[PDB]
Design a protein around this motif. Structure first.
Motif, PDB file in Angstrom:
ATOM      1  N   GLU A 170       0.727  -1.010   0.014  1.00 52.22           N
ATOM      2  CA  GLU A 170       0.197  -0.008  -0.045  1.00 52.22           C
ATOM      3  C   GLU A 170       1.035   1.266   0.067  1.00 52.22           C
ATOM      4  O   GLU A 170       0.491   2.047  -0.741  1.00 52.22           O
ATOM      5  CB  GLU A 170      -1.012  -0.012   1.122  1.00 52.22           C
ATOM      6  CG  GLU A 170      -2.062  -1.182   1.190  1.00 52.22           C
ATOM      7  CD  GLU A 170      -1.617  -2.595   1.595  1.00 52.22           C
ATOM      8  OE1 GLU A 170      -0.402  -2.499   1.916  1.00 52.22           O
ATOM      9  OE2 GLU A 170      -2.389  -3.482   1.457  1.00 52.22           O
ATOM     10  N   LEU A 211      12.542   9.180  -1.973  1.00 49.77           N
ATOM     11  CA  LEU A 211      12.522   8.716  -0.506  1.00 49.77           C
ATOM     12  C   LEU A 211      11.000   8.037  -0.196  1.00 49.77           C
ATOM     13  O   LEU A 211      10.032   8.848  -0.511  1.00 49.77           O
ATOM     14  CB  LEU A 211      13.305   9.712   0.553  1.00 49.77           C
ATOM     15  CG  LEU A 211      14.324  10.356   0.346  1.00 49.77           C
ATOM     16  CD1 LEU A 211      14.789  11.296   1.210  1.00 49.77           C
ATOM     17  CD2 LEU A 211      15.715   9.535  -0.022  1.00 49.77           C
ATOM     18  N   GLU A 221      -0.093  -4.094   4.442  1.00 48.89           N
ATOM     19  CA  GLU A 221      -0.001  -3.253   5.396  1.00 48.89           C
ATOM     20  C   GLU A 221      -0.831  -3.630   6.812  1.00 48.89           C
ATOM     21  O   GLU A 221      -0.250  -3.361   7.786  1.00 48.89           O
ATOM     22  CB  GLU A 221      -0.688  -2.044   5.004  1.00 48.89           C
ATOM     23  CG  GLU A 221      -0.685  -0.771   5.768  1.00 48.89           C
ATOM     24  CD  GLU A 221       0.525  -0.354   6.356  1.00 48.89           C
ATOM     25  OE1 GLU A 221       0.693   0.278   7.602  1.00 48.89           O
ATOM     26  OE2 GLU A 221       1.720  -0.295   5.689  1.00 48.89           O
ATOM     27  N   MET A 255       1.444  -5.748   9.084  1.00 47.70           N
ATOM     28  CA  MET A 255       2.730  -4.964   9.733  1.00 47.70           C
ATOM     29  C   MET A 255       2.228  -4.531  11.149  1.00 47.70           C
ATOM     30  O   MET A 255       1.622  -3.630  11.186  1.00 47.70           O
ATOM     31  CB  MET A 255       3.099  -3.754   8.869  1.00 47.70           C
ATOM     32  CG  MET A 255       3.770  -3.904   7.768  1.00 47.70           C
ATOM     33  SD  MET A 255       4.987  -2.570   7.133  1.00 47.70           S
ATOM     34  CE  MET A 255       5.942  -3.287   5.987  1.00 47.70           C
ATOM     35  N   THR A 277       4.944  -0.959  15.695  1.00 47.60           N
ATOM     36  CA  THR A 277       5.804  -0.677  16.601  1.00 47.60           C
ATOM     37  C   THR A 277       6.249   0.598  16.486  1.00 47.60           C
ATOM     38  O   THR A 277       6.095   1.579  15.561  1.00 47.60           O
ATOM     39  CB  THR A 277       7.169  -1.911  16.443  1.00 47.60           C
ATOM     40  OG1 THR A 277       7.501  -1.776  15.053  1.00 47.60           O
ATOM     41  CG2 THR A 277       6.493  -3.378  16.444  1.00 47.60           C
ATOM     42  N   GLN A 279       9.398   1.420  16.155  1.00 43.82           N
ATOM     43  CA  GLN A 279      10.446   1.161  14.916  1.00 43.82           C
ATOM     44  C   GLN A 279       9.584   1.472  13.798  1.00 43.82           C
ATOM     45  O   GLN A 279      10.151   2.158  12.716  1.00 43.82           O
ATOM     46  CB  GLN A 279      11.365   0.069  14.832  1.00 43.82           C
ATOM     47  CG  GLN A 279      12.605  -0.016  13.836  1.00 43.82           C
ATOM     48  CD  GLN A 279      13.244   1.053  14.008  1.00 43.82           C
ATOM     49  OE1 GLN A 279      13.993   1.501  14.908  1.00 43.82           O
ATOM     50  NE2 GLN A 279      13.512   1.842  12.644  1.00 43.82           N
ATOM     51  N   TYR A 280       8.604   0.973  13.634  1.00 44.44           N
ATOM     52  CA  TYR A 280       7.702   1.001  12.349  1.00 44.44           C
ATOM     53  C   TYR A 280       7.081   2.545  12.346  1.00 44.44           C
ATOM     54  O   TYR A 280       7.256   3.039  11.252  1.00 44.44           O
ATOM     55  CB  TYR A 280       6.519  -0.077  12.511  1.00 44.44           C
ATOM     56  CG  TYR A 280       5.066   0.563  11.531  1.00 44.44           C
ATOM     57  CD1 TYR A 280       4.536   1.557  12.117  1.00 44.44           C
ATOM     58  CD2 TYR A 280       4.916  -0.234  10.392  1.00 44.44           C
ATOM     59  CE1 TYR A 280       3.282   2.082  11.070  1.00 44.44           C
ATOM     60  CE2 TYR A 280       4.021   0.162   9.536  1.00 44.44           C
ATOM     61  CZ  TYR A 280       3.037   1.412  10.008  1.00 44.44           C
ATOM     62  OH  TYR A 280       2.284   1.573   9.256  1.00 44.44           O
ATOM     63  N   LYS A 340       8.702   5.491  13.578  1.00 48.09           N
ATOM     64  CA  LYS A 340       9.720   6.072  13.274  1.00 48.09           C
ATOM     65  C   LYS A 340      10.193   6.276  11.794  1.00 48.09           C
ATOM     66  O   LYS A 340      10.450   7.256  11.362  1.00 48.09           O
ATOM     67  CB  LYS A 340      11.006   5.519  14.301  1.00 48.09           C
ATOM     68  CG  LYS A 340      12.499   6.232  13.843  1.00 48.09           C
ATOM     69  CD  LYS A 340      13.622   5.862  14.714  1.00 48.09           C
ATOM     70  CE  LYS A 340      15.006   6.038  14.154  1.00 48.09           C
ATOM     71  NZ  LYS A 340      15.701   5.477  15.208  1.00 48.09           N
ATOM     72  N   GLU A 341       9.846   4.929  11.316  1.00 45.90           N
ATOM     73  CA  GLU A 341      10.126   4.847   9.552  1.00 45.90           C
ATOM     74  C   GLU A 341       9.222   5.196   9.028  1.00 45.90           C
ATOM     75  O   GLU A 341       9.260   5.788   7.700  1.00 45.90           O
ATOM     76  CB  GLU A 341      10.643   3.328   9.581  1.00 45.90           C
ATOM     77  CG  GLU A 341      12.134   3.187   9.314  1.00 45.90           C
ATOM     78  CD  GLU A 341      12.937   4.279   8.346  1.00 45.90           C
ATOM     79  OE1 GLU A 341      13.031   4.153   7.186  1.00 45.90           O
ATOM     80  OE2 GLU A 341      13.566   4.934   9.227  1.00 45.90           O
ATOM     81  N   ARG A 342       8.087   5.108   9.199  1.00 46.60           N
ATOM     82  CA  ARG A 342       6.792   5.889   8.566  1.00 46.60           C
ATOM     83  C   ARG A 342       6.296   7.218   8.840  1.00 46.60           C
ATOM     84  O   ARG A 342       5.257   7.751   8.236  1.00 46.60           O
ATOM     85  CB  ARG A 342       5.725   4.513   9.063  1.00 46.60           C
ATOM     86  CG  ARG A 342       6.038   3.633   8.169  1.00 46.60           C
ATOM     87  CD  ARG A 342       5.910   3.313   6.715  1.00 46.60           C
ATOM     88  NE  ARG A 342       4.547   3.556   6.401  1.00 46.60           N
ATOM     89  CZ  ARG A 342       3.640   2.672   5.913  1.00 46.60           C
ATOM     90  NH1 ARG A 342       3.872   1.145   5.970  1.00 46.60           N
ATOM     91  NH2 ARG A 342       2.499   2.912   5.627  1.00 46.60           N
ATOM     92  N   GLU A 343       6.911   7.813   9.945  1.00 46.86           N
ATOM     93  CA  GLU A 343       6.768   9.210  10.030  1.00 46.86           C
ATOM     94  C   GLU A 343       6.748  10.319   9.090  1.00 46.86           C
ATOM     95  O   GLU A 343       6.038  11.223   8.806  1.00 46.86           O
ATOM     96  CB  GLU A 343       7.521   9.693  11.353  1.00 46.86           C
ATOM     97  CG  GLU A 343       7.089  11.128  11.936  1.00 46.86           C
ATOM     98  CD  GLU A 343       7.730  11.256  13.248  1.00 46.86           C
ATOM     99  OE1 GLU A 343       8.858  10.745  13.744  1.00 46.86           O
ATOM    100  OE2 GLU A 343       7.335  12.281  13.971  1.00 46.86           O
ATOM    101  N   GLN A 344       7.811  10.004   8.185  1.00 47.49           N
ATOM    102  CA  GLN A 344       8.115  10.936   7.113  1.00 47.49           C
ATOM    103  C   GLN A 344       7.590  10.216   5.718  1.00 47.49           C
ATOM    104  O   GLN A 344       7.621   9.067   5.799  1.00 47.49           O
ATOM    105  CB  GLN A 344       9.469  11.178   6.878  1.00 47.49           C
ATOM    106  CG  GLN A 344       9.790  12.206   8.205  1.00 47.49           C
ATOM    107  CD  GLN A 344      11.214  12.691   8.074  1.00 47.49           C
ATOM    108  OE1 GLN A 344      11.763  13.093   7.083  1.00 47.49           O
ATOM    109  NE2 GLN A 344      11.784  12.871   9.274  1.00 47.49           N
ATOM    110  N   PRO A 362       6.368   9.417   1.745  1.00 47.43           N
ATOM    111  CA  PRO A 362       7.308   9.464   0.377  1.00 47.43           C
ATOM    112  C   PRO A 362       7.399  10.859  -0.234  1.00 47.43           C
ATOM    113  O   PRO A 362       6.445  11.870  -0.156  1.00 47.43           O
ATOM    114  CB  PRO A 362       6.279   8.629  -0.493  1.00 47.43           C
ATOM    115  CG  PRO A 362       5.381   7.696   0.433  1.00 47.43           C
ATOM    116  CD  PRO A 362       5.141   8.753   1.577  1.00 47.43           C
ATOM    117  N   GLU A 386      19.167  15.297   4.540  1.00 47.86           N
ATOM    118  CA  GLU A 386      18.259  14.114   3.746  1.00 47.86           C
ATOM    119  C   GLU A 386      18.847  14.032   2.243  1.00 47.86           C
ATOM    120  O   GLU A 386      19.035  12.889   1.859  1.00 47.86           O
ATOM    121  CB  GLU A 386      16.871  14.410   3.932  1.00 47.86           C
ATOM    122  CG  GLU A 386      16.078  13.440   4.379  1.00 47.86           C
ATOM    123  CD  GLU A 386      14.626  13.818   4.346  1.00 47.86           C
ATOM    124  OE1 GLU A 386      14.045  13.996   3.310  1.00 47.86           O
ATOM    125  OE2 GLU A 386      13.892  13.149   5.508  1.00 47.86           O
TER     126      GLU A 386
END
Lengths: 224, 255
Positions: A95, A147, B181, B184, B187, B189-190, B192-196, B198, B207
């Motif tokens: 997704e 990104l 999705e 998943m 967590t 860690q999920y 922190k990685e998904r906060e910003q 695409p 960056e």
């Protein structure tokens, strides 16, 4: 989910006198025809049918069939607008992949490739409804730096490298194992140790660059 | 009753015709499972684990298996969608270091010494050129392990040239279900990685610098990979020249 890239058929060895009406008539029993394309010079065409099942029947019933004295070659052509995506974080879902690339054009499918254990391989496939949408995504991600997640690891986008595994390669010494002591034995053994050197040189490059990429990941994680 | 849709030279009820059917009702019978697929003609290897909710079914041809999967996949049978997939091919191998003389048929008859071969294909690219890679699919797993072991310990020569083929198991990947999705875990860690979201990195940010440095390293890796090929082509050519010189000297020595 109709008239998808998964419903697209290639038609080879067509006659030169071919019309769009004669091409459409070949697929008349298999529902309403979609986007038709003909290269009259090179003698080949493409057609989208409503469903994968109709494309399956049409392909089976029309491949290797004659038309104006010519034997038709009918095959699936389902990867024209597909893109390979690499350097995906394991937190990139199907997704998210879909949402990220949707900005370049309408999407038919986006999937993260997982292994035999279901874990992310860091690679995905994005298939667009049209070729220019796939083209736009490819140029924007090569010129720019795209990104998907927080870690600023850019996605590597390439057109889906699709090899022929349906037709293959058809039509002096027979197959055998090299016999100990013969001339062909020494030579084949020299090839065995050459193949080992190649494996060793390639595993080294992959390692030394994985380490270089991991050291940059340390700085990435530090920066946070 | 129903057409077979068998391709020219195609064998019947192969592993390529085998379907895995998951998320079945717990009350399913062998008769209720055969009914779901009767429109696709006579089945052969009907398996059902009523307790676990999964089954296997072989259809006459690959086309019939493809039709059944395209029509029946994700369809509701008592408040649950069925999961229909091709059964993972247990006896599939890949062949490397192939001569451009090796045909589909030669690859089939060559590996047909280890046992029965369902399908053998010599991979070609966009232009239809011999890649050097091919694949062998056995009817059962045993012959596949004999092929893998022997071709690795001994040198298996398909043609006149003493260049041995490389036999490895066919890598099995899923490009159908992937990573959804919903499965998943959310967590930290999920998060922190998904906060910003695409995005295209902005020139002038940390960056953009971190990302551009990553692209330069990936470009460096590609250059190094092309450099190893350069070294392999050199090593290959010296070997061919050495063994041609030896074969020629021997021909000049025979009475």
């Amino acid at each position: 989910k109709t008239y998808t890239q998964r419903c697209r058929l290639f038609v080879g060895n067509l006659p030169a006198d071919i019309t769009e009406d004669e091409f459409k008539r070949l697929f008349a029993k298999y529902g309403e025809p979609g986007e038709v394309f003909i290269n009259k010079g090179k003698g080949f065409g493409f057609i989208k049918l409503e469903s994968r099942a109709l494309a399956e029947i049409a392909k089976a019933e029309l491949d290797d069939t004659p038309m104006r004295g010519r034997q038709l070659r009918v095959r699936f052509a389902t990867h024209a607008a597909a893109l390979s995506v690499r350097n995906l974080s394991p937190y990139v879902s199907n997704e998210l992949l879909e949402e990220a690339f949707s900005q370049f054009g309408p999407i038919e499918r986006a999937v993260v490739i997982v292994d035999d254990r279901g874990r992310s391989t860091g690679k995905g496939i994005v298939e667009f409804a049209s070729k220019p949408a796939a083209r736009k995504a490819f140029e924007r991600c090569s010129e720019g730096v795209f990104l998907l997640t927080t870690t600023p690891r850019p996605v590597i986008v390439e057109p889906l490298e699709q090899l022929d595994d349906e037709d293959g390669l058809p039509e002096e010494t027979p197959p055998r194992f090299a016999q100990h002591g013969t001339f062909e034995y020494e030579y084949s053994q020299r090839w065995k140790s050459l193949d080992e050197m190649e494996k060793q040189q390639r595993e080294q490059v992959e390692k030394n660059m994985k380490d270089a990429k991991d050291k940059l990941e340390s700085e990435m994680e530090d920066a946070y | 009753d129903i057409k077979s849709f068998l391709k020219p030279g195609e064998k019947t009820y192969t592993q390529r015709c085998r379907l895995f059917v998951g998320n079945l009702p717990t009350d399913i019978t062998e008769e209720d499972f055969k009914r779901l697929f009767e429109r696709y003609g006579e089945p052969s290897e009907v398996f059902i684990n009523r307790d676990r909710g999964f089954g296997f079914i072989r259809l006459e041809s690959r086309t019939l298996a493809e039709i059944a999967k395209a029509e029946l996949d994700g369809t509701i049978l008592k408040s649950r969608p069925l999961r229909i997939r091709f059964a993972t091919h247990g006896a599939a191998l890949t062949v490397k270091n192939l001569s451009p003389v090796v045909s589909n048929e030669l690859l089939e008859q060559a590996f047909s010494q280890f046992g029965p071969v369902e399908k053998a294909v010599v991979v070609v690219d966009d232009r239809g050129r011999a890649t050097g890679k091919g694949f062998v699919e056995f009817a059962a797993k045993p012959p596949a392990r004999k092929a893998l072991e022997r071709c690795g310990d001994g040198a298996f020569l398909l043609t006149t040239t003493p260049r041995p083929v490389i036999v490895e198991p066919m890598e099995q990947f899923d490009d159908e279900d992937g990573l959804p999705e919903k499965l998943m875990q959310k967590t930290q860690q999920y998060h922190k990685e998904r906060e910003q979201p695409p995005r295209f990195a902005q020139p002038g940010t940390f960056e953009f610098e971190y990302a551009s440095r990553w692209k330069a390293l990936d470009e460096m890796e590609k250059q190094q990979r092309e450099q190893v090929d350069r070294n392999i082509r050199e090593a290959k050519e010296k070997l061919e020249a050495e063994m041609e010189a030896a074969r020629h000297e021997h021909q000049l020595m025979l009475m």
